[PDB]
Design a protein around this nucleic acid. Structure first.
Ligand code: MG
Ligand code: MG
Ligand code: MG
Ligand code: MG
Ligand code: MG
Ligand code: MG
Ligand code: MG
Ligand code: MG
Ligand code: MG
Ligand code: MG
Ligand code: MG
Ligand code: MG
Ligand code: MG
Ligand code: MG
Ligand code: MG
Ligand code: MG
Ligand code: MG
Ligand code: MG
Ligand code: MG
Ligand code: MG
Ligand code: MG
Ligand code: MG
Ligand code: MG
Ligand code: MG
Ligand code: MG
Ligand code: MG
Ligand code: MG
Ligand code: MG
Ligand code: MG
Ligand code: MG
Ligand code: MG
Ligand code: MG
Ligand code: MG
Ligand code: MG
Ligand code: MG
Ligand code: MG
Ligand code: MG
Ligand code: MG
Ligand code: MG
Ligand code: MG
Ligand code: MG
Ligand code: MG
Ligand code: MG
Ligand code: MG
Ligand code: MG
Ligand code: MG
Ligand code: MG
Ligand code: MG
Ligand code: MG
Ligand code: MG
Ligand code: MG
Ligand code: MG
Ligand code: MG
Ligand code: MG
Lengths: 271, 46, 93
RNA sequence: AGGACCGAACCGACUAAUGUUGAAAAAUUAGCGGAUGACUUGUGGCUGGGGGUGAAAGGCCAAUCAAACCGGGAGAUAGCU
RNA sequence: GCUCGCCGGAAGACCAAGGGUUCCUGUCCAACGUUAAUCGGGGCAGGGUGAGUCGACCCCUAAGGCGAGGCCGAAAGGCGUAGUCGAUGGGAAACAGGUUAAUAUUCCUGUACUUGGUGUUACUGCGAAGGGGGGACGGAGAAGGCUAUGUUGGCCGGGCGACGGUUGUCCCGGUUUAAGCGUGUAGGCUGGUUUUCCAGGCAAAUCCGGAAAAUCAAGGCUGAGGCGUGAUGACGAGGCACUACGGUGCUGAAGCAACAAAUGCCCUGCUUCCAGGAAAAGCCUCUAAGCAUCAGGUAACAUCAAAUCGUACCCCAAACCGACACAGGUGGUCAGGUAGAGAAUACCAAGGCGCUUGAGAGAACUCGGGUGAAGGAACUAGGCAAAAUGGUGCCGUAACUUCGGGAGAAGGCACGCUGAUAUGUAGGUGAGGUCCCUCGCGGAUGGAGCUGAAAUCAGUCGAAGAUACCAGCUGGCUGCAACUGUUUAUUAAAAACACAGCACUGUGCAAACACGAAAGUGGACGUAUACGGUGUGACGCCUGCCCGGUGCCGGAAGGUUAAU
């Protein structure tokens, strides 16, 4: 539910919450939880290699099943949960053999719904098939790039791929970027979109809300001294340079894709 | 006012102690130099 | 068993003080200087063997040696171990 | 409920006076701001010098910073005093 | 020694960190101590630190470190797997009283508890490097039930007052007791129980998960406190006997209740929210290989063991960090009384101190304060500084507004004491007694007693009743930045930085990008509703024209054009 907060304080005036009542109010399933401590955007040399990352709430990692490889055995959605580690919600599902798994919650799935995976599975949202067994035109998510590897594409809240064509060993997919891409038709996809499409309508409303999510401040290059950043310097607000990154590469138009290995699999780029 | 020396024996012995010195070649050179100069105390250790 | 040679090393001296005197009269406890590596087990065994008495329990402390100046040179006396040896009954040592 | 309000602890440092061979190589006094948070704090850990780190002041990196400190090249060079 | 003053959410007490003998005693006064010193954290000597239960070590892991092989790198080395370390976190168990010049949960007395090894006896499926459970976790809020503790009364001992009065509705003091053991209460959670089946838990499982049946409903788990015991003890005001007059020795009354009550406990609860809240072992259980009338397990009992190191002392400080016996800095714990919302503030208790030069004098001038005729900002760059405002309840409150605000707008009134209402009320607590009783730490009734607002009326004192301390100045116009934040440690706190929001642009995952000769790693156990870069900076109304220049994107005919 998209809900505006009332302006009882200046930090609340602009907050827009997305509140789902279906989300389990209790604690997650413990055997699918792991520790995932934070990085600060710092690598094994201890250097900041991605800026603007630090703090934020402690988070446990939910082991989500992106492979969706337990074929033939039906499963019931027990409950939908909040996952802190991603934008989509997750569903705790119970397989008829007494095994529980987390999956990415599709749009329109609810506690009680039955899902299945495999070649024989019916064409309904939450069902994972090899994409050769999925009608051309179908909306899908959690799409594999290599068979058995696990879903890598359309996983974020609201996202989905369309199977625009199938030609033998390959399906052509329209991705959320608008990139037309080829993928092996043995690659699995789950039917339907990812849920929580209202995620994007959330308004954080205050600085601290971003800080809660572990995002540290961005200082503009033009606010720095020349020694710090190409945009640095000036007596007043000055610029007079072509926009670049902190390492001097043009950052308004210049393409940076250089991967000749995977160029064969791209039918048409996003444009 | 908080001055710069804020003593901690653990931090002392881990930063500058004998076994830290011994752990790297540059640390072992430190010891070699100090033995050559004939220092009574090679390390903070003692 | 602890060997007799070991036992003949562990007990160094009777410690003499007012506290040691009071200990002996009040609570039948002899205060001994002992070897710094002497265990409570070794002290009990030695007192029983050498002083021919029956020990209830040994308590031990390590005394840190004093830093002392001697003609403008700065020394340090050795650490030593003291043992409060509680005797049973009336053993009388 | 709240980067909500008033206000101690706690964190800070707007004004004034004092002090300026100080009580103090940055404080004291009287006022002052924040005070459930983008808060504050203990312990431990990690990032190293053209390097770090920086809600960005060229700030900070052991009273040192438009390139730390220590040793070395080294008795640099000094048409200057 | 007697007065006086100061601190008392500390300037008391106990610690960690850090220091290291500064501790106690005797002796000394050169030097040290901002003076003197007979004194000392000074000199010299001697003494002093006692643990199965406190802590460390130890078992277990976090961040992170190291790292057999390995991968990578001119060399040096880098990274990392298995492992192994690493607390600031998880893991067995002791309390009260007494005692030293100096230690004490360590000694002593009394009364306990824990784990492990043996042996003995009985019972008996034991067995992991594996499975499962558990450990095991957020912020906020709310309300009960409690206790620490306090107050008053009762009780007991003592008093009858340096000056009017004081045998009383009078004064002073005490009125304390643990862990453990037993009991299972307010509260919290959850339906139990049995049978059968099973694509799951890498194998197996009797366990966990799942499914289907039947049956029964209280069953279990957890849990403060109270109560009993511990305790016929200990402690105890005081009295008596000594004194080496500092201190000991000896004996010992009362030792109850009510009320109030935490920020502590039940509560790792409950409710609620979004930002969605360690790990591993101990522990419990399950089996595998294996072992088999054996080991081994369980229980009882007996016996033995529980080492080693720390333990003095300071610790918001004269002992640590600051060159100083330096107005500085330093994390945790404890939390008395009266007034008060309070850990604010004032005065006090316990306790601790008067800050290691004093003595006079009573000039200018400086510092820190108090008061001020008439005037009242005329001062000045500027109301800088000072003066002022200041509480609670109630009445009342504008433009404008994003409808929240603005607002404590502004402004105003009441305020002490005494009596009455009512010998103390509303309210809270609740004894006895009575009745019921799945019979108890029960329920209902009942109201003794205790505690106790707030108000109204009447009276009364003073110049003044929020009397001290404490404690908003207010309003009008306007620039800038939406806001809370952040910043030049030590002359700049701002209009600067950030910020939510917006936009552009890159990026298809072995992502872009970043660190890195590399291997790797971060981005991310994320996947275009994502991530990076750039500019703008809430919100409202909006954001015009120019692609010539420079840059980027696309194109690729033709011109030119490298190595070869
Ligand atoms: Mg960023
Ligand atoms: Mg931004
Ligand atoms: Mg600047
Ligand atoms: Mg440049
Ligand atoms: Mg300009
Ligand atoms: Mg210009
Ligand atoms: Mg003993
Ligand atoms: Mg000991
Ligand atoms: Mg606030
Ligand atoms: Mg405020
Ligand atoms: Mg600051
Ligand atoms: Mg101040
Ligand atoms: Mg405030
Ligand atoms: Mg500048
Ligand atoms: Mg500096
Ligand atoms: Mg240079
Ligand atoms: Mg040369
Ligand atoms: Mg020279
Ligand atoms: Mg000394
Ligand atoms: Mg002394
Ligand atoms: Mg002198
Ligand atoms: Mg003299
Ligand atoms: Mg001395
Ligand atoms: Mg390594
Ligand atoms: Mg190797
Ligand atoms: Mg490790
Ligand atoms: Mg270990
Ligand atoms: Mg620890
Ligand atoms: Mg003492
Ligand atoms: Mg009580
Ligand atoms: Mg509190
Ligand atoms: Mg002590
Ligand atoms: Mg002094
Ligand atoms: Mg001081
Ligand atoms: Mg402090
Ligand atoms: Mg105070
Ligand atoms: Mg006072
Ligand atoms: Mg004068
Ligand atoms: Mg004056
Ligand atoms: Mg005045
Ligand atoms: Mg006047
Ligand atoms: Mg006047
Ligand atoms: Mg006037
Ligand atoms: Mg004027
Ligand atoms: Mg004038
Ligand atoms: Mg002023
Ligand atoms: Mg004033
Ligand atoms: Mg103007
Ligand atoms: Mg501002
Ligand atoms: Mg400054
Ligand atoms: Mg300033
Ligand atoms: Mg990757
Ligand atoms: Mg700007
Ligand atoms: Mg324009």
């Amino acid at each position: 539910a998209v809900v505006k907060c009332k302006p009882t304080s200046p930090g609340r005036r602009h907050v827009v919450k997305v509140v789902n009542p279906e989300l389990h109010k209790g604690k997650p399933f413990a055997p699918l939880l792991e520790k995932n401590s934070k990085s600060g955007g710092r690598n094994n040399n201890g250097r900041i290699t991605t800026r603007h990352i630090g703090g934020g709430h402690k988070q446990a990692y939910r082991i989500v099943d992106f492979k969706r490889n337990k074929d033939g055995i039906p499963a019931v959605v027990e409950r939908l949960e909040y996952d802190p580690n991603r934008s989509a919600n997750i569903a705790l599902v119970l397989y008829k053999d007494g095994e529980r798994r987390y999956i990415l919650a599709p749009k329109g799935l609810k506690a009680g719904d039955q899902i299945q995976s495999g070649v024989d599975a019916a064409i309904k949202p939450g069902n994972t098939l090899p994409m050769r067994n999925i009608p051309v035109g179908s909306t899908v998510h959690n799409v594999e790039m290599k068979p058995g590897k696990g879903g890598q594409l359309a996983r974020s809240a609201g996202t989905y791929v369309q199977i625009v064509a199938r030609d033998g060993a390959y399906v052509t997919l329209r991705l959320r970027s608008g990139e037309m891409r080829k993928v092996e038709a043995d690659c699995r996809a789950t039917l339907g979109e990812v849920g929580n499409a209202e995620h994007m309508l959330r308004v954080l409303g205050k600085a601290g809300a971003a800080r809660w999510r572990g995002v540290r401040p961005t200082v503009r290059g033009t606010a720095m001294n020349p020694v710090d950043h190409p945009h640095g310097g000036g007596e007043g607000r000055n610029f007079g340079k072509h926009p670049v990154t902190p390492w001097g590469v043009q950052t308004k138009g210049k393409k940076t894709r250089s991967n000749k290995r995977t160029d064969k699999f791209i039918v048409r780029r996003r444009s | 006012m908080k001055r710069t020396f804020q003593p901690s024996v653990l931090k002392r012995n881990r930063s500058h102690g004998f076994r830290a010195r011994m752990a790297t070649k540059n640390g072992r050179q430190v010891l070699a130099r100090r033995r050559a100069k004939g220092r009574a105390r090679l390390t903070v250790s003692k | 068993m602890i060997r007799e040679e070991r036992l003949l090393k562990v007990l160094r001296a009777p410690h003499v003080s007012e506290k040691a005197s009071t200990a002996m009269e009040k609570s039948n406890t002899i205060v001994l200087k002992v070897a710094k590596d002497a265990t409570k087990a070794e002290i009990k065994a030695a007192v029983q063997k050498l002083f021919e008495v029956e020990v209830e329990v040994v308590n031990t402390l390590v005394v840190k040696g004093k830093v002392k100046r001697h003609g403008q040179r700065i020394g340090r006396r050795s650490d030593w171990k003291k043992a409060y040896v509680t005797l049973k009954e009336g053993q009388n040592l």
